[PDB]
Amino acid sequence: EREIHPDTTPVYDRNRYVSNELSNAKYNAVTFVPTLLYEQFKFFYNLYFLVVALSQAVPALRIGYLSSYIVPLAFVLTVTMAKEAIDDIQRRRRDRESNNELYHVITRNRSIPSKDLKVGDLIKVHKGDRIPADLVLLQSSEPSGESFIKTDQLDGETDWKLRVACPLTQNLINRISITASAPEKSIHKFLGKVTYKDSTSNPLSVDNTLWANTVLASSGFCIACVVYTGRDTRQAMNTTTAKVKTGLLELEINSISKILCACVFALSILLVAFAGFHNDDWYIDILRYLILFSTIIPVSLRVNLDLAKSVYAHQIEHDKTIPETIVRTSTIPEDLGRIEYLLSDKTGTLTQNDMQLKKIHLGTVSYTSETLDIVSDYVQSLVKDMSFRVRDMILTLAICHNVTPTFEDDELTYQAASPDEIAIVKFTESVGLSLFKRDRHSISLLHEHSGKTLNYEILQVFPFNSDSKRMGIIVRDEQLDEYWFMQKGADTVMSKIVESNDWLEEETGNMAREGLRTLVIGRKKLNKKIYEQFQKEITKYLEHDLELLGLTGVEDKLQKDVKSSIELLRNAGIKIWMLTGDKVETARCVSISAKLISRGQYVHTITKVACLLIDGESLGMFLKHYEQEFFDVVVHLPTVIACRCTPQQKADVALVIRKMTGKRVCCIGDGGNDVSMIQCADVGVGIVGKEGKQASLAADFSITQFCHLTELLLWHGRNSYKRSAKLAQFVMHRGLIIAICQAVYSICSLFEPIALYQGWLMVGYATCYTMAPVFSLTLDHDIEESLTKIYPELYKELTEGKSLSYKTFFVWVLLSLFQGSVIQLFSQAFTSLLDTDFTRMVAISFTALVVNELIMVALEIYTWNKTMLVTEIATLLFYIVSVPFLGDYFDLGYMTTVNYYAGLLVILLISIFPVWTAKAIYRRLHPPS
Ligand code: ALF
Ligand SMILES: [Mg+2]
C-alpha cells in the first residue's frame, strides 16, 4: 500500500518515502574504520604481522628498533585507508555524474535533477530521455494514449513494450490520486489503483506503468507520476547487497603464510632446543626468535601486494588498446587471470540491439544490403515476371506489418512492438517505397515513392500472438480496388500452409544456420464475395492457400568482434555461458550467429513448469531442487544458454558455479538486470556506451564493448596474477633466506640468532636494500599485448595453480635452506668465526645476501625494460655507498681485499648456479608457446 497525492508536496518531500539518491559507495564516515579493519584482519597473513607488531608493547619481546615494527604497520594502514577511500570517493563521483540528469516537473515548472525527484511529481518525460524512476502513465501525447517503452536495461528484452495511458485520465490538468501496492521483486507485475474525485476507483496493471531504467519511445512527451523511487524501485529491489571480494591469490598467500608461520615456529623451537633449554626462560626465547624470523615476510608481503595492485589498476585503466576502461575495485585485479567460467549476456553485451533486414530471398535468388539499386529500380516501376514478384514482395513487406509512423521536420520515425517489423519498414524505405500515415484504428495506409503517393485501406488485421507465430492482414487497394490477403510468419507454421513450393525448407535452413530471424511471406488475391462471406462470422477459413512471395532474413547486429572474442575465450579454456532475460528464439539466433553454437552440434532444449538451451523457470526449478546432478551434467557441455532469466537466477547460477567447482566466475553485462549477476560473481565487468550504464557503476571493472574483455582477461589479468605470484615468491624467499642465515649462525654458535643482524642492518634488508627489485618484477610480462590474440592457450597454463601451491612453496623453502646455509656456512668458513671476527663475518654474510637477492631478481626477467635495469643498479649503488656513511658501526670491515671478493664470488656462485642451471634445463626441456 502506498498513497500518493501529486500536489501535497511537504508530506512526501520531507519524509515518509525514500529519496531518489542511489549509492554505490560501501563505507560511510561513521563505519569506515571498523568495517575495513575487521574485514582486513580476518585473514591470517594480516593478523600475523599485526600480532608481531603488537608483541613489542610487552617490554620483554623487544627484538630491535621500535621504528621497524610500527612504522610498516602504519604504512600498511595508510595504504589501505588511502586505497578504499579513493575507491569510495570515485564511486560517489561516478554515481553523482548520473544523479544530476534534468527532468521537467509539472508543478515545479523547472527542470530539476533526478536525485531531487521525489514520489508523486508529474514528469513530462520526452521520447529519447531515460525514465527517471518507476513512473505511472497518466496521460500520453498520442490521442490513442499508448507509447512504446524500451526495456533493454530493465530486463534483457529486445522488443518494445506497448504501455497505454490510463483511459480515464488520458483526456485530462487536474490532480489525480494514486494508490499502489508495496514494492516487490516482480518485474512483470503491477497492482495499483487510480483514484479520482467522487470515489471512482480504477484498475492499474503492468500495461500502464513505466519502470526505473526504461527508455521511452513512440510519443513526443507524456505526463507520468512517480510511484516507486530510490531503493523501492523494481530495479533496485531485484538486487542483492554487494559483498567484499577477496581474490583467489589472496587465499593462496593466506595458506602458504600459515605454512610459513608453522615452519618458522618449528625452526625457533628447534633453535631453542638445540641451545639447551637454558636461560630459565625458554618460552620467551622461542617467542623472541619467532618475532625475529617472522617480521620481514608478513609485512613486506602486504606492502608489495597493495602497491602491485595499485600498479595493476593504473596499467589497466591506461591502455590505448582498451580505451575508457575503469577499475572500480582495485583489490582484485588478478582474479581476471584465472577465470574458468564466463557468464556472458546477450542484449547490449553481445548484440547492438539494432536489428536489420540483411537479406531477402525469393525465386531461388537473393538480394542483400549490397546491390540494393536493382531492387530500387524494380520498386520504382510500381507506378519479366521477376520484377512483378519483387514489387509485390516489397508491397507485402510494407503493408503486412504493424508499424506506426510519426512525423518530424524530416527523418520519419517508426514505432512497433516488434523491431524486426521496424527493420522491414526501414528496408522498404531504403529500397524506395516508404511507410507513411497510418490510422491503425480506422482503415488507412499511406506509401509514397519516387512517383505518386499510394493508399491501401486495410480490411482486417490478425494480431501477432505468441502461440501463432503469424501476422496476417486483408487490405484494399485504392487505385486498383483489389482485395489482398498478406501474411508473414515463422517457417514451421507457414511451411505446411503456404503452397506446394519446392525451395522453402532449403533456404530457411540455409539462413537459419546464420542466425537470421527468418519470416516467410505469402499472398492471396481475393474478390468481394469471399470477403463478405468471411465478415459474416474459426481460423480455418482465413488461411486456405497462399502463394510464397519469398522470405526475409533479419539479423541481430553483434557488437564489434563478438564471434572472434568468443572463439579466443573458448580457446583459452573458459567455458562461456550466456544467460539472458530475452526470448528463446532470439537467444538461439544470436548464439548461432556468434558461433556460440557451431556447425552441427545438436542443441537440447528444456521448458518445464552437444549444447544446452534452457528456459528461466526450468533452470530455476532445477537449481532449486536438482543442484548437484544437473550441475554435473552441464559442466561437460561446451556452452549452456539460458533465457528469460530473473537477475536472481543469473546470480544463483554464478553462486552455484563458484560453489560446486571452487572456480572463478566472470560475469559481463550491462543494465540493471545483471547487476546481481555481477555483484555475486568473482569478477564483475560492465559495459557502457548507451543510455544505461547502471551495471558498470556497480561492477568491479568497466569496458566500452565486448571485444575488450579478451585483453582484459588474456593479457591484463593473466599478467597481474603471474606478477603477484612471482612477487610473493620473492618476498617469502628473502625473508626465509635471512631467517636461515640467522638460524645457521645460532646453531654454529650458541649465542642467539637475534645477535647476528642488529640495529640498522635488519631494517635496511627489510626495506631499503631489497624492496625495489620486487616492484621491478611487478612491471614484467612474458608476451606482449600484440600477441595475446595468437596464443590464448597461455591462459590455460595457469589453470592448475602451479604458481602458489604447497609444493612450490616448499621448493622455495628448500631453495632458501640451501642458499642461506651456503651463505652463512661459507661466511663462517672464510672469516674464521670468533668473537673478534664477528664484524667481518656478518659483513660478508649481509653483502652475500644483498647481491644474492639482486642476482635472483635479474635471473627471473623475461623482457628487460629501462624501468627495471635502473631500479636494480639504483639499489646496488645505494648499498655500495650506504656502507660507510649510514653504517660504520654494524658490519664494519676492511673490504678492500682481493681474497674477500673471491670469497664473495664463490659464496654467490654456489648460491646462484643451481637456480640458473635448473631454469636452463627446464627451458631446454619445456620450450614455451
Ligand atoms: F542483455 Al540481457 F538478458 F541479454 F540483459
Ligand atoms: Mg542487461
Coordinates of C-alpha atoms and ligand atoms in Angstrom, one line a residue, residues 152-153 155-156 345 347 349 650 669-674, ligand 2:
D152 CA 16.8 -3.5 -22.8
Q153 CA 18.2 -2.5 -19.4
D155 CA 15.3 -6.9 -18.3
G156 CA 17.2 -8.4 -21.3
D345 CA 24.9 -11.7 -21.5
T347 CA 21.3 -7.8 -25.2
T349 CA 26.5 -7.1 -24.1
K650 CA 21.8 -15.4 -13.0
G669 CA 26.8 -7.4 -18.9
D670 CA 25.1 -4.1 -18.9
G671 CA 21.8 -2.8 -17.5
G672 CA 20.4 -3.4 -14.1
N673 CA 19.1 -6.9 -14.7
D674 CA 22.7 -8.4 -14.5
Ligands
MG2 MG 21.1 -6.1 -19.1

